[PDB]
């Protein structure tokens, strides 16, 4: 019985996001191992195997059955602090937990601002080009 916003810190919540995950028993990147590694399932029509770390917000697709989710998390987002968490959720102190939730919020913000920066720069390219075209004739 925990607030929706904190659910993703719980392994069982993360497992439960995996609706129609294609890699089941026999495979290394099962729901159990994806969740153990921090991922939740964020499928689209386009990107049906899409997964995201709840903590650092890295988004990975193109999963292969032999992929070890933890190694993939390490390779693709090595600064992620969730990877450092050795203790079970209930063995954390509230101070530790609050320190973690603050870093998560900062990660979320950083991701959102990184997105805004790329969208802006793309708009800037369109405006620039259009002005250049006009000055030509």
């Amino acid at each position: 019985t925990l607030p929706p916003a904190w659910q993703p810190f719980l392994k069982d919540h993360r497992i439960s996001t995996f609706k129609n995950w294609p890699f089941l028993e026999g495979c290394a990147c099962t729901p159990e191992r994806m969740a153990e590694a921090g991922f939740i399932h964020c499928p689209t029509e386009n990107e049906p195997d899409l997964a995201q770390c709840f903590f650092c917000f890295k988004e990975l697709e193109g999963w292969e059955p032999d992929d070890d989710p933890i190694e993939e998390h390490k390779k693709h987002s090595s600064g992620c602090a969730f990877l450092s968490v050795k203790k079970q959720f209930e063995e954390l102190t509230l101070g530790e937990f609050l320190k973690l939730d603050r870093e998560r919020a900062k990660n979320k913000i950083a991701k959102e601002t990184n997105n805004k920066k790329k969208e802006f720069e793309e708009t800037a390219k369109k405006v620039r080009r259009a002005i250049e075209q006009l000055a030509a004739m």
Binding site: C29, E47, L50, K58, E59, L60, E61, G62, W63, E64, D67, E72, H76
Partner: peptide, 5 residues
């Protein structure tokens, strides 16, 4: 697995 783009 690869990053999204």
């Amino acid at each position: 697995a690869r990053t999204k783009q």
